[PDB]
Design an enzyme around this catalytic site. Structure first.
Site, short mmCIF file in Angstrom:
data_model
loop_
_atom_site.label_atom_id
_atom_site.label_comp_id
_atom_site.label_asym_id
_atom_site.label_seq_id
_atom_site.Cartn_x
_atom_site.Cartn_y
_atom_site.Cartn_z
N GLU A 1 0.87 -1.16 0.00
CA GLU A 1 0.00 0.00 0.00
C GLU A 1 0.91 1.21 0.00
O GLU A 1 1.74 1.40 0.90
CB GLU A 1 -0.95 -0.05 1.20
CG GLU A 1 -1.72 -1.37 1.27
CD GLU A 1 -2.63 -1.60 0.05
OE1 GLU A 1 -3.52 -0.76 -0.19
OE2 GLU A 1 -2.44 -2.60 -0.68
N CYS B 1 -1.67 8.96 4.39
CA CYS B 1 -1.65 8.58 2.99
C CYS B 1 -2.95 8.98 2.28
O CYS B 1 -2.97 9.22 1.07
CB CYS B 1 -1.36 7.08 2.84
SG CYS B 1 0.34 6.62 3.31
#
Ligand SMILES: Cc1cc2nc3c(=O)[nH]c(=O)nc-3n(C[C@H](O)[C@H](O)[C@H](O)COP(=O)(O)OP(=O)(O)OC[C@H]3O[C@@H](n4cnc5c(N)ncnc54)[C@H](O)[C@@H]3O)c2cc1C
Ligand SMILES: Cc1cc2nc3c(=O)[nH]c(=O)nc-3n(C[C@H](O)[C@H](O)[C@H](O)COP(=O)(O)OP(=O)(O)OC[C@H]3O[C@@H](n4cnc5c(N)ncnc54)[C@H](O)[C@@H]3O)c2cc1C
Lengths: 971, 52, 188, 63
Positions: free
Chosen positions: C134, C168
């Site tokens: 990720e 993020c």
């Protein structure tokens, strides 16, 4: 006039049959009253009550496996020279420990007398069939059950290490009180077929010398099985069967005739009916059999063709002007027939599926046989008291027929019948043969005695009221529409309502095989690197629309593809034979699998992509999870399943909402092109699916293309690594790689395993499709106590394989794909010849052929490469060294398929616990993974996952999206 | 995708979190497709006919 | 649900078919500094739950919370032999991922590092192992003129500046319709 | 040490004694009845009573 070769519809409708059998079953009240009385008396005699197998199973609440284990132990214990030695073993050793050792040694004793002849530590964990039995019942009960099994084995069986020993044991200037049910069946080798021939010939002489001085039918009989007399007794080998077997069967018939004996050809599986009748007709036709009334055969009433077989036998008898003795039975292979029709996707069952339908057909057939006297002498083999009473009543008076039973069954039944009707004749058979043939016979026998539907099992169970045993079959069925069993689906409905099943063909039905052979017989520039790039861009343009086409419409397209595949099965099967070099069964199976892939991915597609998944959360907010296409998938497919793996990978990617650029193996682009055209015709837009043909350099252009969203690959381990490296080198997104690569597949066979079944499954797993299957057996591990017999049986069975043109129906092993492959194989063969023992090297025809080879290695580590051909490697091991076997399997780093052959559940479970292999197959072959039944695919060097044909496959072709909406302003 | 609220604080089991393209491989953490990726599948096929 | 029991597969009579899911082997779990407990624990507990043993290397900036989480898992019933913490730089992370005996990598961090991990994995002649990565985002928001400016402002300020934008998922790029642009920007 | 009792008496007192005795031997819960039934695995006969009850609130029979 000699009747035409037997061909009756294989699996007609049960209801139409019941519509005729139900009214004809009607009997007048005095007729029913007499039957009721006779049957009551026969059953009451049986309940008088040492007994039989059913009693032992019932008394100790034994499974079939446990009964088998104790009978095998009993037989070994009976053959110890000094009965005191057996007594000491039973008290001191049995139940105290060495459970697996006792199970293993006593089973090995059956093929290897020398194997069976320690100090048992206390507190041994009770494993194995005997150990688990001891835990449930206690050691002393197990000892008691073993002694009972010893009485049963000693009283109801005529057994020896060789046939001469059995024959000597069963000796009576007296006449033998019983006829011989010979143990043998399903010869795997030429040597086995001769041994069985010799045992039959020996039995005929032994029984002949003690046949008495009366005329038939008052002379002994012998039962004989065609599968024992020919090692490839199957419809596809009919030509050689007619030529080799008929003279053998004739030779034995003549020897029987010389002693004026009853000589009966047993009836076996439904797929061998027609072939057996061809053999029997041609044998009976011989002038040497004139003047003798003892020739005959068994006819199974559980089969819908039964009445037609009776007509055929009668016409045969009149055409040759013979008298025949004809055995009417219900049928010994019911479960096998159900299983087979299902696996083979037949359009129905050759047998009835409700027990009462078999009972009805039996009485109807018996009535028909009684009317064919005196030319036909009927023999009613049954231990059903109601069936006996009903057949007796129909005879209205008697003679011109007999009953039949098996030693150890229906003893009280038939004693009472003889008291109540003195002119009734009954023939008693005893099983006679070698220890090496016992296991296969025992299994079948224990399935009949343990069956809840068994009359013998019920009559011995005092919980079952006598009147329940007297329910007339017609009253159980009541209505024609109820003839079929409600809880047994037709093979087409095996997966209903999730999806439809592909259709298959029964090779044992000559009409179906001829039609299939007929239909089949009646039936490319590379791409430049620029063309491959345009294909990508074009597929990239088609992605947006296809990804947004609704899942039900994508699914409808796959389902239409399946339908077009099955509609054109002959066309694609022809292609599989010509381009793939596949034998007819392999081609048919590949076609089924291709259709199965379309239907299964369609069904899994609707489930997975048909609607969003609601996620729980706070009020005033919705959260929905969806799965969308990824982009352009590159699908790279191998040559060995050029239609099914090609279509499985492509239709999966399409179903997930991806557009696809597909590059097929260089050797098989044509089937791929036709498949693609077929998908387009099924509703896949031109812009969603493109075919690019060429070598690995073209395959490499596609995978290095910066715009693709994923790769699905099936092929060599080295190529998969270079694809993975080409992908990982990119600065772009990390895309998914699905890679199914090779295996060095092992099978572990222990000494509890049946050698005839191991051999069959090994030969199949290793040599079917010339070993050009990724799941193929490469490495057989066999316990040393049974190694010699097992290797010999495998080698003898390999020798019987026909190698040659895959379009000839008789061929078992076609050519390898190309010269490059043959050369690689031959190099490995040349190397192994200098490195390992050669047990078998078959004769290849001229051309691109490699014949089966069997090598024995000193250790597994001598096999370091996947060898993609018909080449089995064998390692014998000591039972204490199972860990070294398991360690050797781990060492390769592969993990595709693994076979295990053993009777011992604890052993099987320990192996499963230990290994990481993707597909483990227990007591069957390791090939032919079925879509949705065996999700296929491995780990380690064997693959990435997820498994093709399983429920985790489609997801990988998709990406997840969560949509979170604040809904509070609406309420 | 977050509609008419902020874009942060994905809740486990409610918003399975994670992206595609240069943003990630999948599967989404805190969702129902995550655990499977950490496992391998195994099919055991047993011929049970000798038992019934 | 997933590993608690086998899945029965439909098939012919006289045959059983069961699908199971087992651990793969040794997972390397590499976690970032910005969610030093939750992402650390998410990745680690997932691998453990699936039946894998785990070697975990936390971000160099946040090893202490990672050590405490590890000790907490051990105390929660995770055997010492199933979970190991290795602290250090990127070269240590590279050591773990280049190790030929691991069965998979779970990674959360920079896109550049994920690619180098993916390249180190593919370079191996061993099995092709799973990579769960990720990575970042350049996250957009689209606000049209039907949107409530006071709410857009609040959600934009939150999405962009909460945690000093060290998430993020953080908003990086706001698209706003011109008719409402001046007011929305001024309010943010 | 173990003491063994035999039933002793007149026929006129048998019936009443027999009925009670047959209710114990025929009872599905009877240990003797179970130990003689080979369908009942030895380990089932060894379940500790405390493990059958598990919780105080389950002491009374639910049915
Ligand atoms: C001396 C002898 C020789 C024999 N030779 C052969 C032979 O060569 N080939 C052969 O196949 N059999 C043969 N048999 C028959 C087989 O071994 C069984 O003994 C026989 O089928 C039992 O039938 P029954 O009247 O004894 O018992 P039953 O308990 O009345 O009938 C059982 C039979 O019903 C049938 N059945 C069970 N369930 C179903 C169902 N759901 N739907 C439809 N039918 C069902 C099966 O055939 C089963 O065997 C032979 C039997 C004897 C005694
Ligand atoms: C020599 C001798 C003398 C005896 N004298 C007497 C006497 O004077 N008076 C008398 O009442 N009994 C007497 N008994 C006991 C009675 O006859 C039974 O033998 C005895 O209860 C069986 O217990 P167990 O440990 O043998 O068997 P088990 O099978 O262990 O236990 C059965 C007992 O459990 C109890 N039980 C069954 N179901 C339930 C339930 N749902 N809830 C709660 N409890 C249940 C019953 O008491 C039953 O008898 C005597 C027994 C012996 C051997």
């Amino acid at each position: 006039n000699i009747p035409p070769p037997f061909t009756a519809p294989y699996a007609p409708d049960d209801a139409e049959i019941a519509a005729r059998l139900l009214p004809a079953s009607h009997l007048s009240p005095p007729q029913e009253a007499r039957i009721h009385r006779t049957a009551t008396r026969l059953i009451e005699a049986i309940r008088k009550r040492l007994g039989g197998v059913e009693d032992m199973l019932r008394e100790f609440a034994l499974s079939t496996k446990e009964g088998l284990a104790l009978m095998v132990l009993a037989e070994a214990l009976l053959r110890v020279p000094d009965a005191r030695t057996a007594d000491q073993f039973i008290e001191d050793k049995l139940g105290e420990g060495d459970f697996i050792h006792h199970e293993t040694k006593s089973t090995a004793f059956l093929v290897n007398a020398s194997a069976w002849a320690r100090v048992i530590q206390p507190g041994e964990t009770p494993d194995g069939t005997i150990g688990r039995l001891v835990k449930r019942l206690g050691a002393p009960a197990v000892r008691t059950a073993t002694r009972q099994a010893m009485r049963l084995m000693g009283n109801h069986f005529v057994l020896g290490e060789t046939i001469e020993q059995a024959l000597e044991r069963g000796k009576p200037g007296q006449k033998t009180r019983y006829s011989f049910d010979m143990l043998g069946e399903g010869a795997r080798t030429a040597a086995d077929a001769r041994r069985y021939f010799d045992a039959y010939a020996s039995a005929i002489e032994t029984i002949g010398k003690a046949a008495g001085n009366h005329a038939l039918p008052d002379r002994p009989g012998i039962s004989v099985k065609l599968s024992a007399l020919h090692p490839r007794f199957e419809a596809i080998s009919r030509a050689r069967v007619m030529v080799e077997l008929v003279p053998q069967l004739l030779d034995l018939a003549q020897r029987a005739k010389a002693h004026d004996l009853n000589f009966t050809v047993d009836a076996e599986e439904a797929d061998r009916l027609e072939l057996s009748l061809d053999v029997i007709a041609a044998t009976l036709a011989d002038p040497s059999l004139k003047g003798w009334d003892g020739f005959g055969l068994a006819i199974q009433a559980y089969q819908k063709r039964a009445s037609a077989v009776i007509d055929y036998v009668d016409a045969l008898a009149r055409a040759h002007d013979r008298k025949l003795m004809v055995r009417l039975v219900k049928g010994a292979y019911w479960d096998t027939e159900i299983k087979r029709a299902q696996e083979r996707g037949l359009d129905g069952y050759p047998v009835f599926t409700r027990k009462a339908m078999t009972d009805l057909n039996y009485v109807a057939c018996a009535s028909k046989l009684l009317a064919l006297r005196p030319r036909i002498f009927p023999q009613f083999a049954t231990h059903n008291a109601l069936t006996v009473a009903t057949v007796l009543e129909m005879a209205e008076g008697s003679s011109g027929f007999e009953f039949q039973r098996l030693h150890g069954m229906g003893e009280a039944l038939y004693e009472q019948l003889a008291k109540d009707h003195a002119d009734i004749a009954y023939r008693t058979y005893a099983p006679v043969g070698s220890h090496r043939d016992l296991l296969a016979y025992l299994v079948r026998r224990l399935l009949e005695n343990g069956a809840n539907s068994s009359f013998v099992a019920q009559a011995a169970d005092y919980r079952v009221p006598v009147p329940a045993l007297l329910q007339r079959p017609a009253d159980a069925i009541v209505r024609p529409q109820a003839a079929a069993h409600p809880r047994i689906p037709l093979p087409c409905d095996l997966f209903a309502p999730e999806r439809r099943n592909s259709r298959g063909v029964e090779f044992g039905a000559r009409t179906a095989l001829d039609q299939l052979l007929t239909d089949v017989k009646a039936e490319i520039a590379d791409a430049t690197p620029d063309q491959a790039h345009a294909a990508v861009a074009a597929a990239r343009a088609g992605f947006a629309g296809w990804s947004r086409t609704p899942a039900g419409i994508r699914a409808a397209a796959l389902e239409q593809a399946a339908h077009l595949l099955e509609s054109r099965s002959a066309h694609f099967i022809a292609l599989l034979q010509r381009e793939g070099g596949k034998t007819l069964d392999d081609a048919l199976s590949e076609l089924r699998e291709a259709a199965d892939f379309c239907r299964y991915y369609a069904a899994q597609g609707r489930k997975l992509f048909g609607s969003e998944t609601a996620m729980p959360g706070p009020t005033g907010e919705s959260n929905a999870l969806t799965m969308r296409g990824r982009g352009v998938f590159v699908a790279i497919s191998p040559w060995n399943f050029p239609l099914a793996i090609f279509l499985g990978q492509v239709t999966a990617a399409l179903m997930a909402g991806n557009s696809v650029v597909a590059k097929p193996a260089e050797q098989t682009p044509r089937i791929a092109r036709e498949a693609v055209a077929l998908l387009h015709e099924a509703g896949i837009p031109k812009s969603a699916l493109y075919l690019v043909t060429g070598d690995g350099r073209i395959g490499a252009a596609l995978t290095a293309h910066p715009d693709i969203a994923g790769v699905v690959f099936t092929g060599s381990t080295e190529v998969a690594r270079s694809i993975n490296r080409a992908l990982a080198a990119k600065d772009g997104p990390i895309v998914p790689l699905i890679a199914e690569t090779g295996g060095i597949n092992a099978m572990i066979a222990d000494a509890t395993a049946l050698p005839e079944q191991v051999a069959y499954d090994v030969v199949t797993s290793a040599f079917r499709s010339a070993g050009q299957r990724c799941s193929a057996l490469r490495l057989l591990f066999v316990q040393e106590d049974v190694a010699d017999r097992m290797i010999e049986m495998v080698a003898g069975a390999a020798r019987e394989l026909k190698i040659g043109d895959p379009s000839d129906v008789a061929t078992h092993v076609g050519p390898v794909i190309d010269v490059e492959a043959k050369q690689r194989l031959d190099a490995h063969i040349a190397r192994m010849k200098t490195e390992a023992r050669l047990h078998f090297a078959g004769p290849a025809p001229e051309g691109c052929f490699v014949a089966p080879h069997i090598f024995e290695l000193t250790e597994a580590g001598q096999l370091t490469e996947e060898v993609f051909g018909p080449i089995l490697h064998v390692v014998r091991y000591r039972p204490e060294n199972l860990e070294r076997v398991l360690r050797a399997i781990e060492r390769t780093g592969y993990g595709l398929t693994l076979g295990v052959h053993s009777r011992i559940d604890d052993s099987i479970e320990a192996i499963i616990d230990r290994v990481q292999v993707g597909n483990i197959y227990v007591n069957r072959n390791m090939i032919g993974a079925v879509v949705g039944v065996q999700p296929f695919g491995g780990n380690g060097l064997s693959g990435t996952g997820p498994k093709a044909g399983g429920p985790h496959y489609l997801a990988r072709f998709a990406t997840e999206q969560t949509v979170t909406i604040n809904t509070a302003a609406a309420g």
